[PDB]
Amino acid sequence: AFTVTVPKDLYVVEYGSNMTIECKFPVEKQLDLAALIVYWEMEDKNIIQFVHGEEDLKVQHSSYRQRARLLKDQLSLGNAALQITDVKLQDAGVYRCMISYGGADYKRITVKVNA
């Protein structure tokens, strides 16, 4: 029963710091890109779209552009890991990571930013 898990579901972060949020999923083998979809959204803003190996800059929402990246190296370890640099106020909310790799599952993560 393909599960995604969140190590931490609540992130308290400093304004202008850097953050990495993590979704873990089972990779019992060597990651097969033919099977892999990784999506990250925050309140209906598209953040990352990784589709079978394909990463499309064009669909990424204005805010996250040149601040958000998916750590590819980490994928191979079954860790969809979103790095957001220079955390702003508008960055606080519920994040969703959606994964499809054989089965499919998704999880939610809260971010709080201090002023």
Ligand X SMILES: Cc1c(Nc2nccc3cc(CN4CC[C@@H](O)C4)cnc23)cccc1-c1cccc(-c2nc3cc(CN4CC[C@@H](C(=O)O)C4)cc(C=N)c3o2)c1C
Number of chain positions touching ligand X (CB under 6 A)? 15
The stretch among 12-20, 24-32, 65-73, 99-107 that binds a copy of itself (CB under 8 A) is 99-107
Say how far apart CA 62 and CA 50 lie, in whole Å. 17
The residue among 7 and 103 lying less far from a copy of itself, judged by its C-beta, is 103
Q: Select from ligand X, a copy of itself, none the partner in contact with residue 20, using the beta carbon and a kind-dependent cut-off of 5 to 8 Å.
A: none
d(CA 50, CA 114): 30
Q: Could you count the other beta carbons within 10 Å of the beta carbon of residue 102?
A: 11
Q: Does residue 1 touch ligand X according to CB under 6 A?
A: yes
Asked if 100 is part of the footprint of a copy of itself (rule: CB under 8 A), the reply reads: yes
Task: Build a one-symbol-per-residue string for 28-67: x at contacts with ligand X by CB under 6 A, - elsewhere.
Answer: ---------x-x------x--x-x----------------
Q: Does residue 98 touch a copy of itself according to CB under 8 A? A: yes
